[model samples]
Target: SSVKISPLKDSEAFQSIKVGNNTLQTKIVYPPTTRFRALEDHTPSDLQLQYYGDRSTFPGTLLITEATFVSPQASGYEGAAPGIWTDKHAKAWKVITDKVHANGSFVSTQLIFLGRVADPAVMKTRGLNPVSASATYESDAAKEAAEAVGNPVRALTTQEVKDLVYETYTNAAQKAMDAGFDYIELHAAHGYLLDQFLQPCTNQRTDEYGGSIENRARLILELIDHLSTIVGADKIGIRISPWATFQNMKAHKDTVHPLTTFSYLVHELQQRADKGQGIAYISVVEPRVSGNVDVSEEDQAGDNEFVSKIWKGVILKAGNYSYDAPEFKTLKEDIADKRTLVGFSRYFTSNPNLVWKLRDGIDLVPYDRNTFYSDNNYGYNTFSMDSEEVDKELEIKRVPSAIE
Candidate 1:
């Protein structure tokens, strides 16, 4: 006999979650990733509008816009990724936020500074060199890849780094708020500028911004403080990849007494959350894919529990998850037990009606890897619901050839 699962509407997944002064309809979230569909001028186009609108069909789903550059100097991609430093960009994004709001959902923009990950040609075009915490190159492969596109790396002065957090990051938050975003997410993950400053391997500065875990995390905390003033701390969220070794990131190689740098970072965040001045939520990637070469078995085993303990507010966990996978039960249990929110990337990409599909126990459409970043609508908006009629048609087609 087949097993039965509760409808998604009645399941714990669709329950409302209160973060700060706002309430989300469900514990499910759509995390940030590149869509590469912006106009030539780096403004959001109709393609983005339609794509977001299509995904907004599920009420109360939290949608985070793609990784957007906080400034022209911070852009990393060669393709047309969106930027939030200009009035035109704000005007274009207003349409998307408005559409999402109309559908009873909330959206946030994930702002980032690309640092050394920037394409060399793009950096040179702006008459700037890729900047990071220290002058060290990313990695042989990353360096080759960046230089292949004409971008080289450089270290920022203490003053330049301060200006980036106070000016560039703050300006982007204001623009996102003006664009009618429900909130704003600081893209501090995936070895970006902020992450560059957080990890010891990337940060070799002797100033107040480097060395100890507290010093390494200074820039992020400072940026958070600045952004909180612009957009209320209640409307801010952050994404961090502690163990991620991707983009040439590495853990602090302390031979004497190896320290878990991220644990301390989370503890600080927890203290802030304990106070009334807490930010919205903390989104973390699981250790299975954090890219940290030194991630121990213990780290992977208790990733969610550890994050939940350290961060007092909403904890959004991102990693390999599927509606039908066995881990799906674990995700639901985490939500039911610990009030954790699960973020889905590729699942939402393939199933625009994901909430409904899970609610009705319907099968999902598989995403096409080739067209994930295509300019056209092949994979972006072409997938439809697997309704009863569609399923019936599929069943009829599966019958014997003689019967047909």
Candidate 2:
């Protein structure tokens, strides 16, 4: 914590980017999903304060909190996932925001509707049918994982679908306002409720909410429309992973154009934003093929080069980025040096002052793999700080090269 601050140098992670009336000063948008688990007894609201306090950065760092269920029925997993449909939910989140702000960090809550990702056992408890855009289920592994928990969700009636779209987003926006978060990022990516509806691969509805890309994107847009009215456009962020292949859906890697779906959606969404719509920034997570780094950077770049060229907005790119890497260089160049909002997932889990480390040239402590997904705070609280004193004893090199 004794690291000296540079007056002239701006940590892009802490730099404020302006959109409409709001200025998003933080670039380190906390990824909603992580390997870590909270205490089994924790409530979403309690976990909120505990987690944020654990990973607090300097003020203005964007802390996009974990994905919260928009409704009880929308939950995918069990154990303390937050929700935003009631006044109680809003009150709970205020504890998180208050702590985060006290530590000078800005927070945003990710609104999520689990869609077909809901577990059958979880749904059956509530006497609801497990809903999928198409009747097809997720991977056997996923289903097993799903059924191991809470009440199962039932498929919404045709009319219930429209109500869900409005209810989830509007309530989330209202709850976010009550919690004092600076912005709210819609969890529309990663095989969630909105993404399930939008992907024709998953959606089989013959009606207006399915089929074409325009139609598929309609429900999400309607939700966005309602949220814009409630929270204002500048106060919302949309996270999407174009070319993200998940949910065990059959894919034609060579023939299917996933980017086309996202590009068109982004184009339409941006047009609405231009007309003073309620959208702040568009954040995208780059695809990681193997969870392990098997694809060479050159090959991967060649594959996704076109996706970067089409969109226009405050584009935030995140995936497997290290502060010291050639790919980070390429990414910075790819986004014309403006897209410097780097998301360091594992690093943030262990290092709270990642912004300070990068800015002040401090060495990072290696994160423990065993504790990465553990429900308790072993690796989290065990983190070594990056102060000059600690650096000296550990013989840690300041600003270690990526090659090191």
Candidate 3:
């Protein structure tokens, strides 16, 4: 919580970088921040609307929405994260998009489906079972909890993977576009469902969905290609974390070097981009961050130079960019290429005017870790203290009360 702050020089601040059709300011963007303020029906709450409305204070910024579940079956957690499977969800998200566009900012909705990392106990209550690329669990704790609910993790059948999982992703992407989101980023990072399939340690299937690097990456590549047809390549993106050990991912110590698998993924995307089937960008989590917390400097191991070397497109590098600190070394070096966009998560949670602060070199308001995931308004809608920042009358605009 005690991260430092630094102002940017005239040359470094307010620089614009093109992402798709939009040119974002300061080469600075707001990465996904999970406020966990969604309602029971998987729609955003009132606080959620005000929070997003406040964060887009500096116009022309690209703010990626929190990880949204693709379908009810795709969800396996007990938290209040939002979803995009239903029409109502799309309409609700539209309200937020309208606010973003009004301020001249754009939004990217990231689609996610939790597998082994989900709470198996919660999945049971929803008449679902935890499924991953393999039947293996992320940890003994996850296994015990699933068994306690009599719903031990199950691997999805090949048919289900194609019909259910794939269809679910497509359906969600369509909803995102309908809601006026500029981009659809497939959530393939931090050991979630897609990441589970990408890592060799988590995928042990004999079918086409698992085994070799090509097989392990089959589903992701297929989704990207198909989603391209639906949403267009330039409006699509994917996020990856090659060196993260979070959630039982076997970072560099896996059966093969992570680069081999990651490189294959990047190369395939590059080839597709070379043709007419390319994505808008590839967002990579930096080595300094595992999942949420920033790893100690001494513990940092890998570098993203390998990624930039292979994937020659727009790159959004995330993970503790340290814009909260006064030093702009990482930000300067990252945006030096003119195609790079740096993502800020934790500090953006506290500093609503993160882009403005970075441009003028103002100190960022420190964030509290305790309220990061709480379903309350304490840490969320309390940041920007400007008068009349949020529309006070836009109260829980959706009908049919959240029955959860």
Candidate 4:
């Protein structure tokens, strides 16, 4: 009977773990969001600090700042998307990071380069054009989205790619470190610039940067190598969406295989881990809205069985996980068995105290999708903690079985 006992409640998820050079108080993480609340100068605003500070009251291990542009040329989309290209931006971010650290939680910044995802009009205003691995538009819809935002697409010269890696990405990473961020997550997922290079569907180059998985991955590895000079590799994390077909990415059915490409990438990462300059973690988005459109059942199963087994470092799995859902139990089991770590997005948006809610099995308040990207704080910082509601919910759960 002792063998039947499950350690789900007392698993490593609730315990401290080492991430990079820092020790996480727990395994729970709150990933990034595009809050659209930055100032006109692309610096973090007071509203942004308030929003992040409100969420830091919980005991989650890390709170990742929203995806921020790495360079002026990478400022693709509109709104108040933040940037770390200037000293002013770094100064503003320092305030927010200090607030997060004061709250006893770690903070990270998701550095991004928009590439072809930028708006043509915005690019023209700055005398720039969207650039990617090759000179190819994503899809009809992707083109339309770019056109709607006024961004025209262009291919990067091999020389420009080199500059981007050593100059742009590296500069932004250094700024993040100076701003007192505990970690830096490369936004290589969700059809961003790095993702464009990684997937063969968009990269059709004949140079050393394309055609093979190793070549395609060269930029990421080189960027990581450059960043390591400033911040230790262990303090850096990367997010990838291997099977995601969004942003007009596609793998040739006959020429290239997604599984092979990603597996090779993971293997390379594993080798880095073997050396000790290994990265902190790899965040993978499961088959969902932002990833893998037509994945076969076999491929999906292989993703879990193979990818997880290969990466010796921490693996943060993000999808549509909720506390009330059936998969929540499976999530707990996965954590208990040391298979993966969980990341919360929407739940974190609505519930600032998500860690406490999950710890006590309290129901989470639902977030409104409409206000997700708005500049206001109606749904961002206004969520209040209700002790009465949690008490009532717990009381109901403890009712006798034969009460009816």
Candidate 5:
């Protein structure tokens, strides 16, 4: 049975494929679509873990859990978003990862820091300022809204910026490693902390980290350096939404367009990659919205076609990718050719065996829009796989052969 085999080892685009010490048998099983938010503050019942664990192919697929906040001040949205600053966070994540591993799946945790997106209300409640790269706000409306909520924006002093950068990555990387996660992804995307520094639209500093591309990248590079020290290079990954324009910051919008900024960022990251920093991969979160829909052209990542060519390493192209979409073909082809690996955000939400389903030509389940951001467990635990029969699937069969 001679089949057309991709030169890519074990079917993955990365130079090496691994699950613990095991080499992955297929690359098609990855780019797990997982929840974007965390449920740390609010208690998630065991049922939630059961729901997620049941969906994984078990022993075959990789599961990247919901994004977890790296530092206390980094949370952009309130309530139960998982935090990774303490032993409690690591212990809780162990439960989830243990369950996934038992079922034969691998899990990774996403580490995030909210630079400017931290609500000033929460900061001032603790007597801290809502920090940003510079004093620049997207619009008068955003500033007024902050004041209305009693969370006035305060600019981060240069020293404070340096301190925050070090603490955020170090603490996050340490927590993820302790949590038994297979890998860790640094959330440097959206309009959050890292992006605030990189995008000229929000960063208005005249010092070392602003004005020039090299300077703007300094803080993040330093953070990565610190993280490598704590977590080791091979265990870490970084996510950047180069052209994602969510915040309405004016200074960042003025400097460089999303594509140009990202191109430069990737070029610099290539240097780090060569140095054996161990960033497992680089993720570029592209906005699925129409051409520069929310922010100006300079602020957004434009279309998929433009950003894909710019980034290096194991590229995880994320956003809204459909089964019939042209990007699907190209992504698959790239994976086959060892160019990059593709991932889906929303698709993995509703389909647990998404990789198997796609490989076997199974239909996809539509996501519940109402439950996408809900704090409760309703939509989160409601997804069903096509291969699972009603009676057999509902039996809660925890077999001994489970991977974890």
Candidate 6:
């Protein structure tokens, strides 16, 4: 039998920290990732209920829901992902929020807008045009996929950005609040719509939203200010992956210095904080993991020391925190910062009782990489309990085929 390699329960890193006006019992958080479990109408499906409900077994834990589309135009991921744009969606998500609350935990909904990362073919099916910061495709495959639908990605005009982008964000934020979410986190990282605007390689425009570092940072900053008016700034959080080279994003090879752009973004947030409009937190993705895969330690290029140096508000750092060592060296050192929360993903998927399991010195079950993005409840609610009972009745197989 495997034994507990990490004795982190009795450590000082587990102490509670104040985030805005609320307090969490631990510094560990289950960071957001898309589950592809929503119904066709963009509402939470039945499988999502059990997946989220059981993750809250330990009280005061903050769980960020999977990345959700902000509008029909943003719903190009096209594989059962949830959205928060309608009253019906609010009604569906309320059940999950209520379930999380029943176990004495808090939940945050992450709102997303897929830009060049979106499949134009899928957007065509919804009668929407796929657009990005400057009509840039994340890859050759993305461009090919776009042209296959007889439509290539276009650039959103400034007028269109003001009319559609901000409108959808505000509408979705209010819907999350009505749906009983405790916080609203913006998906600005990993080279999605927001990140496409922030990074220079993708955003090649002379407009106010595109040229200089300040110009490149304008859209996200303005959106935060606008969203603060809709919902108080204290209920908002924005995530960034400054050094992550995912989805055709660049770190060291970018035209602008990575720190220059990312620090400017944080500096603006800190400026808002000083004026009493501070957001609840700013979540950053560390370089240990790029996109869905973990990189070896030697290849992990950058660190997050710059973010904490710039922003004084609460911060969350997600990567392979425990992957580097059994002692959870990075986690212990990072959570040592009173204003920081350490994030976990893959381990949490397999271990629903992950919080208690980590705190009480229990070995984690290895997660299956194959069933991660399936259409049914095989690896999802199938491991909802410590007994590890396989609910064979819930397993409806729909394995996507690939050519040899």
- The candidate that achieves the highest lDDT relative to the unseen native structure: 6
Task: List the global CA lDDT of all models.
Answer: 0.75, 0.61, 0.82, 0.74, 0.61, 0.83
Q: Count the backbone clashes (under 3 Å) in each candidate.
A: 8, 14, 6, 9, 23, 0
Deviation in angstroms for 285 in model 6? 0.9
- The model with the greater TM-score, 2 or 3, is 3
lDDT of 3 by residue, 290-318 (tens): 88867776876678887789888899998
Predicted structure 3: clash tally: 6
The most accurate candidate by TM-score is 6
Backbone clash pairs for candidate 1 read 8-359, 120-150, 120-151, 243-292, 244-290, 244-291, 245-291, 245-292
Model 4, 35-97: lDDT tens digits are 777776688886778778887775546888889999998887777788998888888889889
The residue pairs in collision within model 3 are: 4-325, 5-325, 5-326, 6-325, 6-326, 7-361
RMSD of each: 7.2, 7.4, 3.6, 8.6, 6.5, 3.8
Off by over 4 Å in 6: 1-4, 385-388, 391-394, 397-404
What global local distance difference test value does model 6 have?
A: 0.83
lDDT of 1 by residue, 174-283 (tens): 89988998888888887888888888777888998997778988988888778777888888888987656678675433221113666777787777767766888888
Cα miss at 145, model 6 (Å)? 1.8
Write down the lDDT that model 3 would get. Answer: 0.82
lDDT of 2 by residue, 305-334 (tens): 433455455666667655324224543454
Those runs of model 1 whose alpha carbons end farther than 4 Å from true positions after fitting are 1-7, 144-151, 252-259, 290-302, 323-327, 384-404
Total backbone clashes of model 1? Answer: 8
lDDT of candidate 6 over 1-404, digit per residue (tens)? 23345766887546887776667887778999776767867788777877888888888889999999889878788587898999888988899999999988888899999988777778888887887889899888888878988878889898877865468888998899999998899888988998999988999977788888999888888889898988889889999988788898987689897788889889999999999999999999888887787767687667789999889989998887766556887777787768899888888888888888888778877776777777777777677754445555546562211111
